[PDB]
Design a protein around this ligand. Structure first.
Ligand code: ADP
Ligand code: ADP
Ligand code: G3H
Ligand code: G3H
Ligand code: MG
Ligand code: MG
Ligand code: ZN
Ligand code: ZN
Lengths: 161, 489, 489, 161
């Protein structure tokens, strides 16, 4: 029922979709730290279903206790931060499953957290999922892709360090 | 050549000495006793502030090696509202100093509210009916002494704030003055007409005879023998000034015994509709400006509580370390309304409470929550300022003793989702008075001479935890609402 | 010749050895870890109770110098409600023990309440919908394991309480029994029909297959190799028994990890209308009697909190001293709902809170308030018992570890305005089981053989402060109401 | 206006009226500790005005912080306890004035506390003023007088020790 086991098709810095759905303007995330790019800059993603995964090979930084978000540091020296939805922390970890652990190295595509898009769909304030680079200061250029994306597959951003 | 500043605070009495280049040359600090004769009452011993403040001076001058010969002036900053009454002949107090924190005259405020003065008092004083300010403290004093009023109409009795008090003790009884900043705090002075309010004075049964002379925050008030004292300003305002507050929309947050957030409104007295005070500040020449103030009674003092009464820590500095051994407060919240709630709450009935305790909560959870109340309170105020002023801060400038706590500063940033800039010299309250005084003595001439000593030592920027900020704050809110109205009447 | 009793409590695991003359010969106690995986959750490690309890036995026997040859029987007492599930082959738990205190299954209770079972559950179990009892704990377990129910219908999975658990581990898997006292606590057993409730079992999706054998509190259940185990009873009941509870209207208060106040109602199951439980006790031969119980989750445990997490004290014993360095709590109140509120409140949402704090409140104020919550809680319960039972206690008989605190005992007396009698041997919970066991083995024959070991070591009588008792209590009430409903859902 | 200064007329254990008014049955004090003589036995007194005073020469024990009551130990070895009214402690010391100090020796009649019968009259739950011997155990006989009494003057009880 899950092809989890099965082999898949396998195809400057490119950051990969850590989760799936339609790309959105950070500017439209209903939370100022995001919209004004206070925490950093990046994109947002309305979502597909099922899971969040590494967007670069690097090491997983923090994994919020309520497992709705996490950060990671790329081998390239970039910092990403993926935050599922807005105010999700109030669901108290209900919809989330920690597949990864606060400390391992990953490759793009490695599962990181798992989720219940539907429970989250009606419980959450919002489902947007910001994907931002926190260390803006340490990056020269940052390019924002558009439209549809698929986990571990489509790139959301390119950046020059 | 140099200016000497005197900062006489809630906690302690200091003495700083700067040079022409406004460089901190030497400091002397000396803590002093807080007296709690009862419940939410606070008191200091006039003779001890005095004693404490004096002594501090000497020892600074001595420290650095300087004489009456090289000191251009004396700048004076002090704790606000704290009321003192004293026999004019003697130079002896008729009662202990009553502190801004002290909640005794709560009933009196209840009359005032019962009567209808809110509207009036707000409008003319910019203040709010609360035991926080001077007015009611005085009444209570004359009311709790046999030969009081009477002795005072005949004027054998002087009123005064720590500036007035400290001054008179140095102008050997000669000079009886307060500045413009200080006086606003009283609930008896009118901020538009810039003079003692006739109605207040009545309503509260106070005698113009005891009121000192109200004057500019930069002026030579007199000369004293360690020479002239030329600056005066309430501590919060002096800090706004030494931050270079000075121009419209400019704001700072001071983290000391309490927290006071002020914003310059230039020449417009803005009416707060969100629990803030309208009060007086200084303009670039030490002139009267108006401002918005948000006062929070307990900040650093909570830490002193952990340190001195609970005994959970040796130094306040140790709080960063323990607080960070923890990651979270595990659900605990600390509402530090030890002496009621100030802005924007103003509930002198609230008392301190701890919350969300379970069996695995420990001392570190507790210390760190304490630290957090600091940020939260700040944030409550800030929001108010923003609403009242229509302006959105993009950075918060800060000073105070607590600002040396990277944990709290950062936490402050995350919690607000705003940058926090921590100035290079924390001792800004002092600085403020110095300028006011040097300026007045041609020691500096221009404020511009100084858009340079104000180096920014650090910026704190929102981390990823900032996303969590509204959940956390909601806790806080829940909490607060439950410490509310504890005491009765 | 002698009986040996095993008391396996919230805090620790003990082993007492008495003689025919029912004299405490030797004791072995061993503390053990409390695990708080999260919020208001509590858990113990089955293997550790086990380990802890075993070991204690040995070392007691060894201590005194005795063998399998001189020990008439084994009497077993234990912590109630605390649920355990375990693979039958292995002798291995499928999860950690869930404690009576633990609040996890709060949602489940909310269903039950949503459904309409209150009325039913009360009527048949005598219990109240609360995460306190066994039922919901089991469900949650089978619900939080893949191969659970199923594995259990096929019966590879056993359920049990610390008595059942401790037993089976000693009857080497042979014997799977609980007593009558223990079972009542479960929320699955019917107190009138004296057997497993079909509805509960359904509604909660539990499998009769896992339920053990329910039997008399005095009976030889089996034999074990250190010989026969002949007594069984929930700790609270054993204490009521060793107090010589036994006859209608007879009542005791136990001060341990929690506080449990019980009153014998003989053969009548009294319906409480004041927040108390209707449960089972023993009659003079160990037979089924009914009773009224008021349970309070936090008592002595608050002290352990001060001692272990807050670190305000080295020993619990030190609390008398510090508490009495003070005269009053200065206004402070401590609501110790660390794990919700039990009777008569039953609010699993309440969390611990401290109140009425001002700057002069210190550690001693805090410790002593803690101590006071103990009395206050007792008092809340007591009043309930009086209302439910129509009887007015004239003295309160007590036991427990905390009862060694003269301050608290006296305070208890003043606060109630009732005498407090403190029994000569505090280790009464043990005593209870011994009798139950000796009796069952002809070790004693008659309870009367013992209306003599129950000497009264002290009477505490109301001092003059008792006049103040209602003002103080009102505080308490105010307080309590504010810790209420902290947590959400 | 006060003859406080002036000389006054000067006339088994006898306890003297520590305060003035009509004597009452302990049994009628609206508080069980009293009525059931749990704290001890004695009488009650509806009151006159102005003050409470030593009822025996002895030493003043406790003086409740809210100065509504106090105790004292007679040179004879008796313990008395005078509690003004019922639940008065809630007035928080409003109506009371501490003339004496928790530790001195007194003679009958020495002022101990002073009060405002009228403020107390409408504020208090009750104004009854119990006068009881706390050390019942150490006394053989206890005799209860009746009717009207005057401070420092009329005896309320006689007791055999
Ligand atoms: N590292 C620290 N963290 C927190 N509080 C601190 C720290 N260092 C000093 N303090 C606190 O800061 C306050 C002292 O600040 P200061 O500006 O000197 O206040 P004030 O003018 O009211 O005397 C105290 O209340 C104190 O206990
Ligand atoms: N002097 C004391 N004052 C208060 N608490 C005490 C004192 N001595 C021991 N304890 C407390 O009493 C409790 C131990 O009582 P016990 O009857 O052995 O409880 P349990 O059966 O739950 O293990 C603890 O919670 C403890 O910290
Ligand atoms: O409103 C009173 C303020 O002046 C207190 O200042 P402080 O914290 O430095 O003592
Ligand atoms: O209701 C549970 C009680 O059995 C707890 O007993 P305890 O305090 O001795 O551990
Ligand atoms: Mg200061
Ligand atoms: Mg026990
Ligand atoms: Zn979040
Ligand atoms: Zn009283």
């Amino acid at each position: 029922g899950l092809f989890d086991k099965l082999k898949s098709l396998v195809s400057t810095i490119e950051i990969i979709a850590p989760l799936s759905g339609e790309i959105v303007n950070i500017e439209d995330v209903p939370d100022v730290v995001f919209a004004e790019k206070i925490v950093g800059d990046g994109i947002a993603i309305k979502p597909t279903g099922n899971k969040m995964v590494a967007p670069v090979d690097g090491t997983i930084g923090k994994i919020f206790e309520t497992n709705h978000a996490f950060s990671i540091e790329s081998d390239s020296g970039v910092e990403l931060f993926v935050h599922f939805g807005i105010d999700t922390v109030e669901l108290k970890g209900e919809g989330f499953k920690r597949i990864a652990e606060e400390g391992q190295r990953v490759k793009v595509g490695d599962t990181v957290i798992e989720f219940d898009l539907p429970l989250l769909e009606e419980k959450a304030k919002s489902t947007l999922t910001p994907v931002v680079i926190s260390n803006m200061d340490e990056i020269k250029e940052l390019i924002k892709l558009s439209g549809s994306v698929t986990v571990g597959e489509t790139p959301v951003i390119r950046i020059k360090k | 050549k140099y200016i000497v500043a005197l900062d006489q605070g809630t906690t302690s009495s200091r003495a700083v000495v700067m040079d022409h280049d406004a460089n901190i040359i030497s400091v002397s600090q000396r803590e002093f006793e807080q007296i709690y004769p009862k419940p939410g009452w606070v008191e200091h011993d006039p003779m001890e502030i005095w004693a404490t403040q004096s002594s501090t001076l000497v020892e600074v001058l001595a420290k650095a090696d300087i004489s009456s010969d090289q000191i251009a002036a004396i700048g004076i900053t002090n704790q606000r509202e704290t009321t003192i009454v004293w026999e004019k002949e003697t130079g002896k107090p008729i009662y202990n100093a009553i502190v801004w924190q002290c909640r005794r005259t709560a009933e009196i405020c209840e009359h005032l509210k019962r009567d209808g003065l809110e509207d009036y008092i707000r409008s003319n004083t910019g203040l709010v009916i609360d035991p926080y300010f001077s007015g009611t403290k005085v009444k209570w004093i004359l009311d709790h002494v046999e030969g009081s009023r009477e002795r005072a109409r005949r004027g054998e009795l002087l009123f005064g704030t720590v500036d007035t008090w400290l001054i008179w003790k140095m102008t050997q009884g000669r000079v009886h003055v307060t500045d413009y900043t200080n006086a606003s705090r009283t609930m008896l002075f009118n901020i538009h007409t810039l003079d003692w309010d006739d109605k207040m004075l009545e309503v509260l049964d106070i005698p113009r005879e005891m009121l000192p002379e109200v004057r500019r925050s930069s002026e030579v008030y007199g000369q004293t023998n360690i020479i002239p004292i030329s600056g005066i300003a309430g501590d919060q305002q002096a800090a706004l000034f030494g931050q270079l507050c000075v121009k419209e929309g400019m704001a700072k947050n001071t983290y000391g015994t309490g927290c006071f957030m002020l914003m310059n409104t230039g020449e417009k007295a803005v009416k707060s509709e969100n629990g803030l005070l309208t009060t007086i500040a200084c303009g670039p020449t030490g002139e009267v400006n108006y401002a918005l103030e948000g006062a929070v009674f307990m900040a650093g003092a909570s830490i002193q509580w952990l340190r001195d009464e609970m005994k959970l820590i040796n130094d306040a500095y140790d709080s960063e370390y323990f607080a960070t051994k923890v990651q979270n407060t595990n659900g605990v919240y600390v509402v530090p309304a030890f002496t009621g709630l100030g802005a924007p709450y103003w509930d002198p009935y609230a008392r301190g409470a701890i919350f969300g305790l379970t069996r695995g909560v420990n001392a570190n959870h507790i210390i760190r929550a304490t630290l957090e109340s600091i940020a939260y309170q700040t944030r409550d105020v800030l929001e108010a300022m923003q609403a009242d002023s229509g302006i959105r801060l993009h950075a918060l400038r800060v000073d105070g003793g607590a600002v040396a706590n990277n944990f709290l500063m950062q936490f402050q940033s995350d919690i607000l989702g705003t940058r926090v800039e921590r100035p290079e010299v924390r001792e800004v309250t002092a600085l403020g008075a110095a300028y006011l005084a040097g300026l007045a003595v041609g020691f500096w001439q221009n404020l511009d001479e100084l858009q340079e000593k104000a180096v920014i030592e650090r910026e704190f920027r929102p981390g990823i935890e900032t996303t969590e900020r509204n959940y956390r704050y909601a806790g806080w809110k829940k909490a607060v609402k439950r410490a509310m109205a504890w005491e009765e009447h």
